[PDB]
Amino acid sequence: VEKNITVTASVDPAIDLLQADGNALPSAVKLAYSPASKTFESYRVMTQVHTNDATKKVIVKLADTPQLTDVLNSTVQMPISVSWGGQVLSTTAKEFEAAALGYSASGVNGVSSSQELVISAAPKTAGTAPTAGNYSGVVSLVMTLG
Amino acid sequence: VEKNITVTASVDPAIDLLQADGNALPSAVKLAYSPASKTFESYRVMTQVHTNDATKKVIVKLADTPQLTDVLNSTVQMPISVSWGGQVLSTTAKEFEAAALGYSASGVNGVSSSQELVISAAPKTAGTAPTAGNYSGVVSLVMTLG
Amino acid sequence: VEKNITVTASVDPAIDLLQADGNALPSAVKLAYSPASKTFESYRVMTQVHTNDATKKVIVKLADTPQLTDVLNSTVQMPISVSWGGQVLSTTAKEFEAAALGYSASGVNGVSSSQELVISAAPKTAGTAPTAGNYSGVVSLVMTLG
Amino acid sequence: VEKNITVTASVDPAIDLLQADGNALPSAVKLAYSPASKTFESYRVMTQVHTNDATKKVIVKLADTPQLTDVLNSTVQMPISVSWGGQVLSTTAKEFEAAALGYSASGVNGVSSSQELVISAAPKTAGTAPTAGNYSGVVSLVMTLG
Amino acid sequence: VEKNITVTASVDPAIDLLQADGNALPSAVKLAYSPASKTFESYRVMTQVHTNDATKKVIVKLADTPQLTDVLNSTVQMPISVSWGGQVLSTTAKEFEAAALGYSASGVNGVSSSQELVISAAPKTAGTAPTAGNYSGVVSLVMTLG
Amino acid sequence: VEKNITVTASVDPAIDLLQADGNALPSAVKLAYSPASKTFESYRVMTQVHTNDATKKVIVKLADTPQLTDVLNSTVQMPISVSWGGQVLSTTAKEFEAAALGYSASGVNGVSSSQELVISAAPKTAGTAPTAGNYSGVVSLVMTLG
Amino acid sequence: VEKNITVTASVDPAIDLLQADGNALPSAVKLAYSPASKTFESYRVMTQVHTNDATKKVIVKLADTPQLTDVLNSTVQMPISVSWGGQVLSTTAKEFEAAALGYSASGVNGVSSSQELVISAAPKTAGTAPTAGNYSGVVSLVMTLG
Amino acid sequence: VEKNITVTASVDPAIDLLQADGNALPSAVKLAYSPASKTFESYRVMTQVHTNDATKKVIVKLADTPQLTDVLNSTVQMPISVSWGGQVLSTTAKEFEAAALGYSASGVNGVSSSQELVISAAPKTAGTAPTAGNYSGVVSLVMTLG
Amino acid sequence: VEKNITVTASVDPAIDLLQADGNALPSAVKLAYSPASKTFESYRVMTQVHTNDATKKVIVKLADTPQLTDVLNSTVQMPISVSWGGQVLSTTAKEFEAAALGYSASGVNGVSSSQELVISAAPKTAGTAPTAGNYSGVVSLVMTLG
Amino acid sequence: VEKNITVTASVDPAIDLLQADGNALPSAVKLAYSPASKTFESYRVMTQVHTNDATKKVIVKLADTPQLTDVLNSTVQMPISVSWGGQVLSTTAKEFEAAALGYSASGVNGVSSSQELVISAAPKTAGTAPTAGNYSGVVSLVMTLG
Amino acid sequence: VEKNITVTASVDPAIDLLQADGNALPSAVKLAYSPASKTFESYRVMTQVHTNDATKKVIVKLADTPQLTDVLNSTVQMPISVSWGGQVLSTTAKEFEAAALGYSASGVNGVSSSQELVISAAPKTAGTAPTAGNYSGVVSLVMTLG
Amino acid sequence: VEKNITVTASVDPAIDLLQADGNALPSAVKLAYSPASKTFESYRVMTQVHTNDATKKVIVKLADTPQLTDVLNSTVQMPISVSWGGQVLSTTAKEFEAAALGYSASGVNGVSSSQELVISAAPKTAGTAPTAGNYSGVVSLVMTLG
Amino acid sequence: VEKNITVTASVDPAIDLLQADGNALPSAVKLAYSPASKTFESYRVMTQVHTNDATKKVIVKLADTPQLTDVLNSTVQMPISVSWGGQVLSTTAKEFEAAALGYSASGVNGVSSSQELVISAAPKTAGTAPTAGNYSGVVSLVMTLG
């Protein structure tokens, strides 16, 4: 009754971000939208960086296009509003103090403190509800260790 | 340590239903079953419609098959009993008074009053417990603004 | 570093069926089989017809042989059980009411309501598990606009 | 504004255990740990069996591994201490008298009396606090009707 | 608007393993890695064997190479740590008692009890984080009925 | 039982583009078309350039005819809309900053950051669905290192 | 409208290797090359030997020249790295245990277990990317039944 | 640098069969053979007749010898098993209903529906694997419009 | 067992066209014809010019008669539609920019970029299917270096 | 309508070489030439010796003049580069081990394994493209059984 | 520069056989011989009779000596094995049904269907390879219209 | 063993026509005849004029009698249809532009481009097959340099 | 109807040269001439010496006048260029090794290997085309056995 399965992984020492509970982060999410408020639902997560070096500061930015579109119209576009660690992130570089994270906090060396993550996104135009339709797009959270 | 994520959304002005607390509704649920009562658990939610027009009445119905089955026998079937807003819903059209909802109620224009939602479901046959097994099926809650 | 790629497409106005989320449908699928139940896994999808004419009724049937076989024995055969839109489909013609689909539903004109799709298949014989082996076959979902 | 939802269920006549109030039981729980006492928090519930046969005695055991671990180290392990109905449960079979439960008690035939449930768990080693970290594991409460 | 689809299946009486909920098992998975712990994420599933003979004991082993590599360097290798049913599995034969599984348990004859599945994997070397890179490899879970 | 196989390859140092996961890119793709939107499906991929020189900027253009046709009428033509790296590509030369790609990002020197790829294509004429038929054509993605 | 077609085949009892799914194996393949790693892509397949005698051990080797070249320079050469069944193959004879393959495994007598196949190939020289160009060559997988 | 090329074609109005995608059909094919099943591989294609008259029924048969042989022994012979359009074909005349093909189906007038094609072939003798060797032979698919 | 073989070649410096993969081009081809579309099959190739001088522009034309006929009636004639490099070719002279070809592209000096080749051909008369019959004719692709 | 035909043949026991598929070898071939590489196209074939004695070793050489010329200038000459069976051949005698060929391989006694054949040829002078012109010459592959 | 040429022809109404493609048949052929099989190569052609009368049946036989010899020993002889139209031919008269040929088939009146032609030939003696040498002989295919 | 041989030649500067490959032209040819089409086979060659003066235009005509006859009846006659260089030739003078031939084309000065040659011939009478018999006659291709 | 015929022959043991196929050699030949190259056509044959003594070496030369002339002017003369067996021949004596010919080669004792024969001839003067005219002359190939 042999039943095979695929396995994969990705290592990248000077560890990535992870879920605060000690699991992986999502690979997807759904957001709502209320044109009575003209906002998506502000998706939120608490997360805990790990590392392999407790001093080096962590660098963050994004790829060019944190924006959605129509699943069957590539022309429609709407940006995305991202923020983590207590403030906004950009396509340009940010950098966070290692001391401001508690690597020797509750758990074990490398485990930072729990950090607020936020994924919002809004219409590009104010006072304007976008077109009725299923929309989609990807955030490619650039991040590294300085 | 770049870590990308998918995002999606769906707009449809003249807003859908939403959770009363001001969040999204469930995408899934589990129900029990007691053949000592021969009923599932009557799942319940309080919800709050939004809109983009405070006068137009809201229309409701369902798709053809609010019924479950066996996860490995498509032949087994059992209907589902749905009701919202104080009464039952059908595959045929209902319609609710806008004035009977309080769009200028506690919060802000468009926010209706909190509405009782109910998802029950029962054996198709009376005095008959169905077969032992994991069962499944989807409700496609048709709804729109008249 | 020039790297070329093939592209294709198929148009057929009075649109085909599509995935409910606003994407393409599968080109393949795998089904299980439990001879403890003597059924395949009842594969299921929610889908949304489009069109170029909101009145005309949609016609459906199948090609002659919705049946599987052995990948290395063409003699073995087992039929397939298909159903969509709330009922079974045949090699003979069905036809669905346009009004019973909600082309002016949640999204935009032409977008029907979400429709249940089902792909099951069973042994031709009752109380009979077929031969151990990888099996295969194709469904050619005839469909058009009346 | 059509918004679909998943539904599921599981039947198994000769009913499972249920919450004493007449609801479902938890699907999860959190426990603390005090190495000043070197114990988790003794989680507790009152519950009420149902059935479809008031005479047959109810059998209980567990799957092999009522033990936790580290969420990112499968090697760490610590057992779990379970007890229900007034005494301990095992990976081996127990069995409870039907008469000792009051199926004709307060409510209606089948409704047993309220039964104490207990979920504790401790370090495998005495005088030893385990490693700092989020831990996890599942109990698979085998149970049936004799 | 004819739209064809492929279908396949695989039978093998004396059934394979399946998802505990009554669905298929995954065909793929992703694991993380924290060199602060120097472990992948311990992936886990609860599963339920089926059969066509309730007495015969189930045999298990693996193919030669439960190990990963680099997607663009076949030389890199790291083993994989598998365990199911309460203990480890090997490239050599194991065998499980039928009585220790509950084929007459909650559901119906053949349906075993829910069994813990675990897929971990670690660096071959201790105190050594592997090279930064996307890695891959397959487990071919040999299994049969004794 | 000797069974021979062909092998080929193509080298071109100052590496081509590759799949972000660390595999090859597609050699083909299928696109849909909805004349309710009058768009193909916006096909998308995340990709990661490699190189042999981390400073030199990467040049891009296309061959003359990013357009489809009819498989049995060479006269029918419809252009193609391509874009990569955050913007559109042409039959004329583009050029991308090396610093804006993260060659020292998550993985190893040369591995750029993950880049959005997009393959759309539309009718040449607005408000015009093309003829019913299977269509085809090739994109020859000119690209090199400046 | 008579339209003729060629057919061929090759028998060789004591069967050759075949695709694990129950189909033929490839007649060709493409490999990449990254001089950032200085490796081709490690091509991989899972396969299942058949036979006409379940005891006899299977012998393997290769023809003299598992190496590529330039399509327009026969002088350029680079070897190929092959391995199957859990280890490397040579121009010299190997031999595999019949018992170590599971001919009475999941399917039917003769069907071995699924075996890992690997086709890699590298520059003959270390720290040396070969010349820019389309390359080619054939592997003639000698194999027989001992 | 003048480089000449041959061109040919064949017209025969009341069109021949063609590939379903809108291309030509194969001029050759290879089949396997497993004497563990004692069958070739059941080769399969989906195809779409065209015509110049939508009413007339299409006639089919074969030439005398749908059989293979040895490439260096004309005495060896083995028949071939052909079937198309949902059933078997012969050296004698068949005939298919025009209405049962959908000439006004998805595409344009004349384009029939997609039709299953099958090319199998077996040993003439049961329980008998033929001689080891490369074999060959041609099918001359007689067909016309009634 | 001496077995002799003929060899030939043709040099012409300032190289001819060649197959893009790095092989020779075809010496022949077959085209279909569908009088439901009244077109042959649009045959296509991607190709790569070479040279011995990277500046000089390449000149193209054709011989007088890019037309087919009947294999046993020289009177029947039908022209041929040729196009390469992004546009049509004639019996008169064309000329292509060297800079518009990428001789320093992916490979090595002289290797142009991949160029689309097209060989179509149609009935001389519109709304007219030619006579049933095998047809033939040659294209003599005049070409040189300006 | 009597139509006569010539037939010939050549026997020479201790068989010659033959095509690997089980057919005759070519009597002619065309080679290209790229003075951007200054090489002909490396023509290649896989072949299978036969014999009438499985032990005796096979001897090979060539006649004096494996070289081309001009079809209208006998003075022009360019040598030819031949190699078979994994290495080069000469006007002098080579000899191959019978055991190194697999006469009891896939097929039947006498049928050797598939052997790589290569026909290249180059300008006699380095850095020198020969004269523009059609060239020709014959290889007389001396070969026998030792 | 006057250059004269010979021309000839042969008419014989109630036409001879011809090549199926619409060309002449061969005037010569070469056959191999493998005394490992002790057979020549089974030469084969597909052909299409023409006529001037669609009813009359076609008669066939041969001249006395379908046999080869030595080019320098007239005493050596070996017969020839001919077959056409689905069966063997003789020095005695055969005759074929006109209706069994499709004169109103794909092309035009008179054009029969494509017919298998076969030219084999073998040693006169079994288990006997003939003498080493170039051999020759002619078949004079008697044929006419009954 | 002295063995003598005749040699001849013919010079005529301002060269004659020659075979395009760089060889002599035929001295004879055979044509078929199908009274189902009432045409001979349209014999065809590609050829390349040479010269000793690249400007002068080439003149062409024929001798009086491009017609066949019976080999044993000089009274029977049938004309011949000749055409070269893209059009018909006569017993009267034609003349071709030197510039329209490419003397500086692919090869070397004097070598014209490849020119289509055609030798057809038909019954003198329409709807009339000539007498059964071997026929013959000569074309004397007058040609010179103007 | 008595019809007589002449016969002749010539014996000369220690055999002459013969055609490689096993026939006689030509008694005549025609050569072309291109004053664009100022060469005749290089006539060529492959041939096979026989003998009556396998050791003795074969001697070759020519008679005095391997030269042509005018058929009606004996004064015009042009030499001839002969070469055989891999090199030139003279009016003086050459001699070839018996061992370098393979008398025990493919066929039977005495049959040498196939030897290249060449008959060229050129103007006596360089840069000089001879007079327009039919020319002639004989080569008397002296040859014997040393």
The token pair at C40 is 């395949």
Q: Closest by alpha carbon to E121, among E27, E26, E41, E35?
A: E41
Residue F2 and residue H132: Cα distance in Å, rounded?
Answer: 12
Task: Give the distance from residue C15's alpha carbon to the nearest chain H alpha carbon, in angstroms.
Answer: 10
3-state secondary structure of E40: coil
Residue C139 and residue C118: Cα distance in Å, rounded?
Answer: 12
Give me the residues of A, 1-40, that contact G with CB < 8 A.
Answer: 1-2, 4
The token pair at H48 is 């779409």
- Spatial contact of F83 and F128, defined as CB atoms under 8 Å apart: no
- Spatial contact of I112 and I106, defined as CB atoms under 8 Å apart: no
What's the angle, vertex CA A82, arms to CA A78 and CA A83, rounded to 5?
Answer: 160
Phi-psi region of I48 (alpha: psi -120 to 50; beta: other; left: phi over 0): beta
Does K36 contact J23 at a Cβ distance shorter than 8 Å?
A: no
Q: Closest by alpha carbon to I3, among H15, H140, D25, J27?
A: J27
Report how far Cα H9 is from the mean position of its chain's Cα atoms.
19
Residue A57 and residue C62: Cα distance in Å, rounded?
Answer: 62
- Spatial contact of M138 and L6, defined as CB atoms under 8 Å apart: yes
Please give the span between the terminal C-alpha atoms of chain D, in angstroms, as a whole number: 50
Cβ neighbours of residue E2 under 8 Å, at least 6 residues apart?
C140, C141, C142, C143, C144, H102, H105, H106, H113, H114
Contacts of J37 in chain G (CB under 8 A): 70, 72-73
Q: Closest by alpha carbon to D74, among D123, D128, D133, D33?
A: D133
- Spatial contact of F119 and F31, defined as CB atoms under 8 Å apart: yes
Q: Are strands E3-10 and C30-31 parallel, antiparallel or unpaired?
A: parallel
Does J5 contact K29 at a Cβ distance shorter than 8 Å?
A: yes
Q: G71 at the I interface (CB within 8 A)?
A: yes
Give me the residues of G, 127-146, that contact J with CB < 8 A.
Answer: 138, 140, 142, 144
The secondary structure element, H or E, covering residue I100 is: none
Q: E106 at the D interface (CB within 8 A)?
A: yes
Contacts of G136 in chain I (CB under 8 A): 22
3-state secondary structure of M100: helix
Contacts of G103 in chain C (CB under 8 A): none
3-state secondary structure of L47: strand
CA contacts within 13 A on the Cβ side of M34: 23
Please give the span between the terminal C-alpha atoms of chain B, in angstroms, as a whole number: 50
- Spatial contact of D12 and E106, defined as CB atoms under 8 Å apart: yes
Phi-psi region of C106 (alpha: psi -120 to 50; beta: other; left: phi over 0): alpha
The token pair at L36 is 């189902």
Place of tokens 């990888």: C134
Task: Give the distance from residue I134's alpha carbon to the nearest chain K alpha carbon, in angstroms.
Answer: 6
Beta bridge partners of J74: none
Contacts of F133 in chain H (CB under 8 A): 22, 107-108
Contacts of I113 in chain C (CB under 8 A): 2
Place of tokens 């089955």: B69
- Spatial contact of M23 and J10, defined as CB atoms under 8 Å apart: no
CA contacts within 13 A on the Cβ side of I67: 15
Does F39 contact A12 at a Cβ distance shorter than 8 Å?
A: no
DSSP state of C72: T
Length of chain E: 146
Three-state secondary structure readout of L32-90? CCECCCCECCCEEEEECCCCCCCCCCEEECCCCCCEEEECCEEEEEEECEEEECCEECC
E strands, F93-132, are: 94-96, 115-120
DSSP string over F48-83? ----S-SSSPEEE---S--EEEETTEEEEEEE-EEE
Task: Give the distance from residue H12's alpha carbon to the nearest chain J alpha carbon, in angstroms.
Answer: 27
CA A115 → CA A21, A47, A61, A100, A111, distances in Å?
12, 5, 16, 11, 11
Nearest CA in chain M to K71: M22
Residue C4 and residue F26: Cα distance in Å, rounded?
Answer: 10
Positive or negative, the CA dihedral J75, J81, J84, J87 is positive
Place of tokens 């360089």: M126
CB atoms within 10 A of CB A52: 16
Task: Enter the resolution in angstroms.
Answer: 4.0
Length of chain J: 146
Containing domain of residue C91, as a range? 1-146
3-state secondary structure of A47: strand
Q: A107 at the D interface (CB within 8 A)?
A: yes
Q: Closest by alpha carbon to H96, among H106, H79, H84?
A: H84
Q: Closest by alpha carbon to J76, among J18, J132, J10?
A: J132
Amino acid identity of M56? K
3-state secondary structure of M101: helix
Q: How many beta-carbon contacts under 8 Å exist across F and H?
A: 14
Does B129 contact D23 at a Cβ distance shorter than 8 Å?
A: no
Alpha helix stretches (DSSP H) within M27-89: none
Write b or e for each residue in C43-73: b if 16 or more Cβ atoms lie within 10 A of its Cβ, otherwise e.
bbbbbbbbbeeeeeebebbbbebbbbbbbbb
What total number of domains does chain J contain?
Answer: 1
Place of tokens 């479901």: B121
Helix, strand, coil tally for chain A in percent (to 5): 0, 40, 60
DSSP string over G61-89? ---S--EEEETTEEEEEEE-EEEETTEE-
3-state secondary structure of C101: helix
Q: Closest by alpha carbon to L29, among K27, G109, C31, A72?
A: K27
The token pair at G64 is 């003299």
Amino acid identity of D91? T
Question: Phi and psi for I25 in degrees, rounded to 5?
Answer: -90, 165
- Spatial contact of B9 and A31, defined as CB atoms under 8 Å apart: yes
Q: C105 at the D interface (CB within 8 A)?
A: yes
Place of tokens 């056959």: K31
Q: Closest by alpha carbon to A38, among B17, B59, B50?
A: B50
Cβ neighbours of residue F142 under 8 Å, at least 6 residues apart?
C2, F60, F61, F62, F63, I102, I105, I113
Write b or e for each residue in J84-113: b if 16 or more Cβ atoms lie within 10 A of its Cβ, otherwise e.
bbeeebeeeebebebeebbbebbbeebbbb
Answer whether A touches I (≥3 Cβ pairs < 8 Å).
no
Task: Give the distance from residue A13's alpha carbon to the nearest chain F alpha carbon, in angstroms.
Answer: 9
Write b or e for each residue in K6-29: b if 16 or more Cβ atoms lie within 10 A of its Cβ, otherwise e.
ebebbbbbbbbbbbbebebbeeee
Nearest CA in chain L to H4: L114
Answer whether D touches B (≥3 Cβ pairs < 8 Å).
yes
Amino acid identity of L76? V
Residue K142 and residue J42: Cα distance in Å, rounded?
Answer: 46
- Spatial contact of F13 and G135, defined as CB atoms under 8 Å apart: no
Positive or negative, the CA dihedral C123, C124, C129, C134 is negative
Three-state secondary structure readout of chain J? CCEEEEEEEECCCCCCCCECCCCCCCCCCEECCECCCCECCCEEEEECCCCCCCCCCEEECCCCCCEEEECCEEEEEEECEEEECCEECCCCCEEECCHHHCCCCCCCCCCCCCEEEEEECCCCCCCCCCCCCEEEEEEEECEEEC
Answer whether H touches C (≥3 Cβ pairs < 8 Å).
yes
CA contacts within 13 A on the Cβ side of M24: 8
Residue E137 and residue E123: Cα distance in Å, rounded?
Answer: 14
Length of chain I: 146
The token pair at A15 is 């560890």
- Spatial contact of M141 and L2, defined as CB atoms under 8 Å apart: yes
Place of tokens 């032409």: C110
Which one of F52, F68, F73, F145 makes the best mutation probe of the I interface by having the most chain I beta carbons within 10 Å? F73
Residue E137 and residue E73: Cα distance in Å, rounded?
Answer: 12
Residue I130 and residue I33: Cα distance in Å, rounded?
Answer: 10
Residue I143 and residue I97: Cα distance in Å, rounded?
Answer: 14
Residue I67 and residue I64: Cα distance in Å, rounded?
Answer: 9
What's the angle, vertex CA L134, arms to CA L130 and CA L135, rounded to 5?
Answer: 70
Residue D11 and residue C70: Cα distance in Å, rounded?
Answer: 36
The token pair at B8 is 């999606």
Please give the span between the terminal C-alpha atoms of chain K, in angstroms, as a whole number: 50
- Spatial contact of B50 and B143, defined as CB atoms under 8 Å apart: no
Q: How many beta-carbon contacts under 8 Å exist across E and G?
A: 46
Contacts of C106 in chain D (CB under 8 A): 1-2
Cβ neighbours of residue K100 under 8 Å, at least 6 residues apart?
none
Amino acid identity of E109? N
Amino acid identity of K46? M
CB atoms within 10 A of CB F97: 8
Report how far Cα A128 is from the mean position of its chain's Cα atoms.
26
- Find the CB nearest A24 among E41, E135, E138: E41
Residue D23 and residue D28: Cα distance in Å, rounded?
Answer: 15
Cβ neighbours of residue A40 under 8 Å, at least 6 residues apart?
A31, A32, A33, A120, A121, A122, B9
Contacts of J46 in chain G (CB under 8 A): 138, 140
Answer whether F touches G (≥3 Cβ pairs < 8 Å).
yes
Answer whether B touches M (≥3 Cβ pairs < 8 Å).
no
- CATH code at position I102: 2.60.40.2040
What's the angle, vertex CA G134, arms to CA G133 and CA G136, rounded to 5?
Answer: 130
- Spatial contact of I68 and I16, defined as CB atoms under 8 Å apart: no
Helix, strand, coil tally for chain B in percent (to 5): 0, 40, 60
Q: Are strands J3-10 and K30-31 parallel, antiparallel or unpaired?
A: parallel
Nearest CA in chain C to G20: C134
The token pair at G117 is 């196949």
Amino acid identity of A70? D
Write b or e for each residue in J1-24: b if 16 or more Cβ atoms lie within 10 A of its Cβ, otherwise e.
bebeeebbbbbbbbbbbbbbebee
Q: F70 at the A interface (CB within 8 A)?
A: no
CA I82 → CA C6, I38, I88, I96, I125, distances in Å?
21, 17, 6, 16, 17
Task: Give the distance from residue A3's alpha carbon to the nearest chain G alpha carbon, in angstroms.
Answer: 9
Q: Closest by alpha carbon to B10, among H14, J41, A30, F57?
A: A30
Sheet holding I143-145, edge to edge: I94-96, I58-60, I143-145
Place of tokens 């048969």: H61
Length of chain C: 146
Residue K115 and residue J15: Cα distance in Å, rounded?
Answer: 33
CB atoms within 10 A of CB M41: 24
The token pair at L88 is 């018909």
Which one of B134, B135, B136 makes the best mutation probe of the E interface by having the most chain E beta carbons within 10 Å? B134
Place of tokens 């139209």: K85
Question: Phi and psi for F56 in degrees, rounded to 5?
Answer: -50, 135
DSSP state of I24: P
CB atoms within 10 A of CB C39: 22
- Find the CB nearest L9 among M26, M135, M143: M135
3-state secondary structure of H101: helix
Does G85 contact E72 at a Cβ distance shorter than 8 Å?
A: no
Residue L127 and residue L133: Cα distance in Å, rounded?
Answer: 18
Residue I133 and residue K139: Cα distance in Å, rounded?
Answer: 30
- Spatial contact of A57 and A144, defined as CB atoms under 8 Å apart: no
Which one of B25, B34, B62 makes the best mutation probe of the D interface by having the most chain D beta carbons within 10 Å? B34
The token pair at K139 is 């078949």
Residue J88 and residue J66: Cα distance in Å, rounded?
Answer: 13
Nearest CA in chain J to F2: J106
Task: Give the distance from residue D7's alpha carbon to the nearest chain B alpha carbon, in angstroms.
Answer: 5
- Find the CB nearest J137 among I2, I7, I18: I7
